[PDB]
């Protein structure tokens, strides 16, 4: 008996991202020192001539998506919604996303353009007082999602559950260790002082806003109609629009507007590479409503 | 004549001029320097529309179908293969719009020192610089460093017409 | 020829357009066509038989605050100098 999304609804994003913090130090002692990493008054950023290496550290929360819905004006429609997500967790238990994520996290996408020209890239991923074997970051590659690794499995599992009702959150932090060399370029994040570049400025030392890493991790989509042709992954957008190729790679019958009216408004099975992005789509957020 | 594709992948954050910039200039140069006869370079998706563009494409040209083969082109880029990958079959052709290079006058300062000891000595000439330079800086550029001058400069391209000729050491006409 | 080279005497042309055009707003049933043949008349009075690279036309008084379509209501301008103009006005003009 439903007829249309209701005239408010929103959700809230399960994966939050705190912003990042750089810091410099040498290589040979990086587990017994640290220094602060700031900006050069257009402004600029440069490491100094006894370091060779950018630290940057970020963490993450997961939440549980069934109890993340913040607004919905008609209980049948919330009613279709949980029997729908709890449909997919006897399928899949969110374990094929979750993996997407912990590759994501692995193949280091949250340094852009601070990753051509290292020479050696570590990540170490530490999940309550437990750390986790480190990864080479460089025997990964930007187009392949492996799923034969043990901690990314032993991580994508944890996560899994979380995703789905079994725990209630999940924190995760994350270090890295970027080797370019001595008085080097940084490349931070920039600022819409909306001249001149200026740069961002956390707690006085440089960093990222947390959009960009989160924007990073979100680039999992390889599931659209014209993949064949163009073979890269793009991030998970609505009406996807990835702004590097500026032209729409899902503008009709695939877009998540429709999908969902075809999934909720009129009860038909969709395959499991559209069920697998409309339940990220939710995992990401937004205020995805109508003007009844 | 016969051609090597060069592709930089795509969406992989850093920009297309950058990897180009960076990557494709400095080693096609040295290979340029050491196999002494002139090779080509075409830019296939140039699309002046305001300011100008270069593509994510370019071709190396040349007119043996061994001398190519001496560039061992697939092999030299080994490092950065995550953001280029070198199709490997020298096929001929016969479409393309060969490029040039512009030039920009150059800072008032610089001019002025030969412009004094050169004689000519002492408004006219600022006018010189803004018009002259104002015109040219809305093409494509491909920023050069540098081995002797050991400076930083930037190369301006512009299409042409000429079809066939001699080419320089960086590529152009 | 009809082409602005200085880049001090932006300023006057900001004002100049300030000056004439502060609280003279109209709407749209209320302002000059753009035509097409004024823009070539300009064309021909110092030589150019196409817009020269990087330069884009301009009304020294804007058509929205209050100003002729005419030959001595245009100036060529550099492609980020006209980018100045711009937006100058429109803080002023909000």
């Known amino acids: 008996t439903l007829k249309s999304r209701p005239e408010n609804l929103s959700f809230a994003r399960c994966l939050n991202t705190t912003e990042a913090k750089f810091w410099q130090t040498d290589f040979l002692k990086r587990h017994t020192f ?10 600029s950023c440069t490491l100094s001539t006894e370091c060779d290496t950018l630290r940057i550290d970020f963490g993450i929360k997961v939440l549980p998506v069934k109890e993340s819905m913040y607004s919905c004006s008609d209980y049948n429609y919330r009613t279709a919604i949980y029997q729908k997500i709890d449909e997919y967790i006897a399928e899949d238990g969110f374990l094929t996303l979750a993996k997407r994520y912990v590759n994501n996290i692995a193949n280091a996408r949250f340094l852009w353009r601070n990753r051509k020209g290292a020479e050696i890239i570590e990540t170490i991923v530490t ?29 994508a599992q944890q ?21 370019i060399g001595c008085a080097m370029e940084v490349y931070p994040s920039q600022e819409m002082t909306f001249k001149g570049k200026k740069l961002f400025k956390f707690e006085g030392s440089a960093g990222m806003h947390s959009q960009k890493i989160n924007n990073a991790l979100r680039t999992i989509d390889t599931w659209y109609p014209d993949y064949t042709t163009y073979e890269f992954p793009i991030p998970v957008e609505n009406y996807g629009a990835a702004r590097s190729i500026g032209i729409p790679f899902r503008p009709d019958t695939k877009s998540f ?14 395959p499991i590479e559209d069920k697998h992005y409309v339940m990220a789509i939710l995992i990401r957020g937004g205020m995805f409503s109508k003007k009844q | 004549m016969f051609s090597q594709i060069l592709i930089i992948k795509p969406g992989t954050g850093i920009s297309p001029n950058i990897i180009i910039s960076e990557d494709i200039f400095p080693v096609l140069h040295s290979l340029f320097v050491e196999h002494d006869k002139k090779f080509g370079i075409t830019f296939p998706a140039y699309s002046f529309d305001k300011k100008g563009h270069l593509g994510n494409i370019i071709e190396v040209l040349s007119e043996d179908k061994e001398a190519l083969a001496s560039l061992c082109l697939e092999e030299h880029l080994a490092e950065v293969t995550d953001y280029v990958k070198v199709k490997k079959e020298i096929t001929f052709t016969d479409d393309y719009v060969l490029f040039k290079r512009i030039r920009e006058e150059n800072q008032y300062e610089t001019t002025a020192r ?10 006219p000439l600022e006018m010189h610089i803004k018009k002259k ?27 042409t017409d000429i079809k066939h000729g001699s080419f320089s050491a960086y590529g152009l006409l | 020829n009809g082409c602005l080279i200085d880049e001090a005497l ?9 000056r004439k055009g502060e609280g003279n707003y109209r709407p749209r049933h209320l302002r000059d066509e753009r035509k097409e043949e004024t823009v070539q008349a300009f064309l021909d009075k110092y030589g150019y038989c196409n817009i020269p690279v990087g330069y884009e036309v301009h009304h020294i008084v804007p058509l929205s605050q209050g100003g002729a379509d005419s030959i001595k209501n245009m100036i060529m301008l550099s492609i980020e100098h006209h980018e100045r103009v711009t937006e100058a006005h429109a803080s002023y003009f909000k």
């Open chain 2, 133 to 159: 330079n104002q015109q040219i800086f809305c093409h494509a550029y491909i920023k050069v460093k540098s081995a002797s001058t050991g400076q930083s400069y930037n190369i301006f391209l512009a299409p």
């Open chain 1, 127 to 155: 999940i309550e007082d437990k750390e986790y074997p480190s990864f080479n970051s460089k025997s990964f590659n930007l187009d392949t999602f492996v799923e034969d690794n043990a901690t990314i499995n032993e991580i």
């Open chain 2, 114 to 123: 030969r412009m004094r000891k050169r004689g000519h000595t002492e408004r």
């Open chain 3, 10 to 18: 932006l300023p006057l042309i900001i004002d100049e357009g300030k």
């Open chain 1, 257 to 270: 507007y429709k999908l969902i009216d075809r999934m909720i408004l009129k009860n038909e099975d969709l």
């Open chain 1, 159 to 179: 996560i899994a559950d979380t995703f789905a009702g079994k725990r209630e959150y999940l924190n995760i932090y994350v270090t890295c260790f970027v080797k």
């Open chain 1, 34 to 43: 640290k220094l602060p990493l700031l900006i050069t008054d257009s402004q």
